[PDB]
Amino acid sequence: NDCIFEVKHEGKVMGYACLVGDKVMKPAHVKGTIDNADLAKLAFKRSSKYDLECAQIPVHMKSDASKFTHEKPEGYYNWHHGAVQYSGGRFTIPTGAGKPGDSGRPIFDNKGRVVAIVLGGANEGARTALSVVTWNKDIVTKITPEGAEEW
Amino acid sequence: NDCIFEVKHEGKVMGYACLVGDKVMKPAHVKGTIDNADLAKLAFKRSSKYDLECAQIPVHMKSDASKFTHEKPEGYYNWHHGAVQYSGGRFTIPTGAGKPGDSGRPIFDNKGRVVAIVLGGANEGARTALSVVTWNKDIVTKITPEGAEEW
């Protein structure tokens, strides 16, 4: 709720940035700048291999960072627009939820820990398969289902 | 309660020394002499890499030694000036607690065992992070966050 910041361009909202651990993450394909006067001055590194950019959080903001884990048991998870179902190694969301411009939203576990960042999604009749970026011990990985499109 | 001795310099209180296990421990950066007449006569060894000084406990005072362990599960702990929380590999306390000259205080477990000596910390708005000297199997180790300052 407090860890989400908006990225704007010419008055419109393009997407969100999130503070996790000690790093700031922003999707690579999203245009614009960060509204916060202090975060806007950070230098970023880019990698097109995962569509990620990251930077180091300044000291005085560390108390506002969210917690994270890597464990992914089967069950139900929550996010800004409702619940998301995890089964079979894939995230699914009821059709109609989510629109372009809402990329960068976290997915939370029951205790509020971050498990994934949503970057678009695929088209299917009754249920939507999501395209996500997740992590593991000392690695990151990009998981993209067939037919995924950018949001 | 009984294991803490006061170190003074020219009438002013500089810090505390702890009697733990079979050793007397004092932070290296604190000046002054030990109030106890017997302890002031001991020979000391120094290591500037860990900011520690220690000496062997004399025979007739050993009955005052506290117990200790090395296990550090996540949870809550207590100290002289309030509560301390341990999570994420760091010890943190609410902002405003702690003042210069209080260095050398123990952190206690639920059963009264010593787990750490506190030597300063880093300060931000809502919370502070402590700089601590801790130990592990057959070694000692020093953990210091970015921006820490001495107390």
Taking the Cβ of residue A67 and every Cβ of chain B, the question of whether any pair is shorter than 8 Å is answered with yes
B112 interface with A at CB cutoff 8 Å:
no
- Chain B residues touching A63 at Cβ < 8 A: 124-127
* Chain A residues close to B124, C-beta within 8 Å: 59-63
Q: Name the E strands within chain A.
A: 4-9, 12-20, 23-27, 33-34, 45-47, 52-56, 75-79, 82-87, 90-94, 106-108, 114-121, 127-136, 139-143
Count CB atoms within 10 A of the CB of residue B130. Answer: 24
Q: Which amino acid is at B127?
A: R
User: Out of B88, B126, B146, whose CB is closest to A59?
Assistant: B146
Whether residue A23 lies within 8 A of chain B, CB to CB, comes out as no
Domain ranges, ordered by start, for chain A: 1-66, 67-151
Q: Which two tokens stand for residue B81?
A: 């000036």
- CA–CA gap between residue B28 and residue A101 (Å, rounded): 56
- As to burial, measured by CB atoms within 10 angstroms (0-12 exposed, 13-18 middle, 19+ buried), residue A25 is buried
Cα-only R_g, chain A: 15
> How far apart are the CA of B128 and the nearest CA of chain A, in angstroms?
9
Coil, strand or helix at B151: coil
Mark yes or no for CB contact A60/B124 under 8 Å. yes
Distance CA B103, CA B151 (A): 6
- Strands across the sheet containing A23-27: A33-34, A4-9, A12-20, A23-27, A52-56, A45-47
Cβ-based contacts of B126 with chain A (< 8 Å): 63
Contact A27, A15 (CB under 8 A): yes
Q: Are B147 and A63 a contacting pair at CB < 8 A?
A: no
Question: Quick one: which H or E segment has residue B19?
Answer: strand B12-20
Q: How was this structure determined?
A: cryo-EM
Residue B143 token pair: 């953990």
